[PDB]
Amino acid sequence: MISLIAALAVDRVIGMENAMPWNLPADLAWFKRNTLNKPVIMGRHTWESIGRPLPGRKNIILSSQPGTDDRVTWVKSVDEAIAACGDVPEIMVIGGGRVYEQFLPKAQKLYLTHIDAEVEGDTHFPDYEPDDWESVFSEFHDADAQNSHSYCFEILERR
Numbered sequence: 001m002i003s004l005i006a007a008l009a010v011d012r013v014i015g016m017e018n019a020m021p022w023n024l025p026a027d028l029a030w031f032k033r034n035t036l037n038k039p040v041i042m043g044r045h046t047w048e049s050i051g052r053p054l055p056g057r058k059n060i061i062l063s064s065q066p067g068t069d070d071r072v073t074w075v076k077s078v079d080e081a082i083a084a085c086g087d088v089p090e091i092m093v094i095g096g097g098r099v100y101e102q103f104l105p106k107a108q109k110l111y112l113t114h115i116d117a118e119v120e121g122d123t124h125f126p127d128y129e130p131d132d133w134e135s136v137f138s139e140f141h142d143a144d145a146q147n148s149h150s151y152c153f154e155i156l157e158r159r
C-alpha cells in the first residue's frame with residue numbers, strides 16, 4: 001500500500017524556495033508517529049530541504065543522477081523506488097510536489113494536515129479529485145503557545 005503524507009497551507013501551498021516557512025511542532029510529531037519504522041520516499045529537492053537522514057526509517061531518494069550519500073538509498077524511477085521498499089505493509093511518500101504528483105494515482109491513503117496559514121509559495125500539493133476520497137479520521141486543534149496556527153489532521157482513504 002502506498003500512502004502520501006503532507007502538510008498544506010491555504011491554497012494547497014507546501015513550500016517556498018525549497019523550505020517550509022512555518023513551524024508547527026505538533027504536526028512534526030504527527031509526521032514522525034505516522035512514518036517511524038516505515039520506508040519513506042522523497043524527491044531530491046526534499047532531501048536537500050530536510051538536510052539529513054530521517055532516523056528510524058529507510059530513506060529512499062528519487063533522482064535521475066547518481067547518489068551522493070550512502071546513508072540513504074538512491075533510485076532512478078517510481079517502480080525502482082517501490083521495489084527498494086521491499087515487502088512492507090505501508091510505503092510513505094513524503095514529497096515534494098513533483099513526487100506527490102507521480103504517486104497520487106497509486107496511493108490508497110492520504111495523511112493531510114490542513115494549516116490555517118496564508119504563505120506565498122512556489123510548490124503545491126496536487127489537485128486531487130475530492131469525490132475519490134473518503135475521510136476516515138479528522139482532528140481539529142486550535143493554535144496554542146507552541147503552535148501558532150490552527151490545524152486539522154485528516155486521513156483519507158481512496159473510495
Ligand SMILES: NC(=O)c1ccc[n+]([C@@H]2O[C@H](COP(=O)([O-])OP(=O)(O)OC[C@H]3O[C@@H](n4cnc5c(N)ncnc54)[C@H](OP(=O)(O)O)[C@@H]3O)[C@@H](O)[C@H]2O)c1
Nearest residue numbers: 006007015018019043044045046063064095096097098099
Ligand atoms: N509541506 C509538506 O508536506 C512538504 C513535503 C515535502 C516537501 N515540501 C516542500 O516541497 C518543495 C520540494 O518539492 P519539489 O516539487 O520542488 O521537488 P521534489 O518533488 O522534492 O523533488 C523533485 C526531484 O526529484 C527527482 N525525481 C522526481 N521524480 C523522479 C523520477 N520519476 N525519476 C527520477 N527522479 C525523479 C528529480 O531529481 P533530479 O533533478 O536529481 O533528477 C526532481 O528534480 C520544498 O519547498 C519542500 O520544502 C513540503
Ligand SMILES: Nc1nc(=O)c2nc(CNc3ccc(C(=O)N[C@@H](CCC(=O)O)C(=O)O)cc3)cnc2[nH]1
Nearest residue numbers: 005006007027028029031032050054055094095113
Ligand atoms: N504533516 C506533515 N508535516 C510536515 O512537516 C511534513 N514534512 C515533510 C517534508 N519535510 C520534513 C522536514 C522536517 C522533518 C523532521 O524534522 N522530522 C522529524 C521531527 C520529529 C519531531 O518533531 O518530533 C522526524 O523525526 O520525523 C520531516 C519532514 C513531508 N511531509 C510532511 N507532513
Ligand SMILES: [Mn+2]
Nearest residue numbers: 077078079080
Ligand atoms: Mn521503468
Ligand SMILES: [Mn+2]
Nearest residue numbers: 083086087088
Ligand atoms: Mn514483493
Ligand SMILES: [Mn+2]
Nearest residue numbers: 116117149150
Ligand atoms: Mn494563522
